[PDB]
Design a protein around this ligand. Structure first.
Ligand SMILES: *[C@@H](CC(=O)OCC)[C@H](C[C@@H]1CCNC1=O)NC(=O)[C@@H](CC(=O)[C@@H](NC(=O)c1cc(C)on1)C(C)C)Cc1ccc(F)cc1
Length: 179
């Protein structure tokens, strides 16, 4: 859990958008990822600091279906420690995962969510979404953007839940490639 701690210190930041509080994962250089619904647009507050967003790309699959992830490029001289080696090449399930949440209201929280399983299609508030996974844990509002981690891997970003189960967008390394 010193890997989760390293991630927390170096790569996981408390942020806010017009849609409220979220956890943000910095991946490399000036590149970070958020849940799509956070809708950062042209700026974002990182630990209360107002920062320009140079580009926001909402990811879709080949079929043009929502993946519920937004890649943001930040206007800063700060580079995130490169964690691409910890992101699997294929969307991966895991046993006994930890959900890492870090927002102003929920700072530095490690939440064991149990096993993460393939789910796939998700009707997320009427928005057809692909490539999701599921955990049998009652995730709550304010936890979107939380980072799903396992044995030295970063496998998902929290995006939704029904009060009983939680769902993440799966991560694959190629999402973060340079060009
Ligand atoms: C995180 C963002 C936030 O807190 O929004 C506050 C309104 C949040 C986490 C969940 C809240 C409840 N438990 C969760 O872990 N995500 C959301 O609220 C999104 C929408 C939902 O999660 C819906 N749940 C489902 O649709 C659903 C379907 C199944 C089989 O299980 N759950 C709501 C009905 C609660 C926010 C969102 C994302 C994308 C969109 F297009 C619209 C809205």
């Amino acid at each position: 859990l010193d890997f989760a701690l390293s991630l927390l210190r170096r790569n996981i930041r408390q942020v806010q958008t017009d849609q409220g509080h979220f956890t943000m994962l910095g991946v490399r250089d000036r590149l970070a990822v958020l849940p799509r619904h956070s809708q950062p647009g042209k700026t974002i507050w990182i630990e209360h600091k107002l920062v320009n967003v140079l580009d926001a790309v909402e990811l879709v699959d080949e079929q043009g279906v929502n993946l519920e992830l937004t890649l943001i490029t930040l206007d800063t001289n700060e580079k995130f420690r490169d964690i691409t080696k910890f992101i699997p090449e294929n969307i991966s399930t895991a046993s006994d995962a930890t959900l890492v949440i870090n927002t102003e209201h929920m700072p530095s929280m490690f939440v064991p969510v149990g096993d993460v399983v393939q789910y796939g299609f998700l009707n997320l508030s009427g928005k057809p979404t692909h490539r999701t996974m599921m955990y049998n844990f009652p995730t709550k509002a304010g936890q979107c953007g939380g980072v799903v981690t396992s044995v030295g891997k970063v496998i998902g970003i929290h995006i939704g839940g029904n009060g009983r189960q939680g769902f993440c967008a799966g991560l694959k390394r190629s999402y973060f490639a340079s060009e």
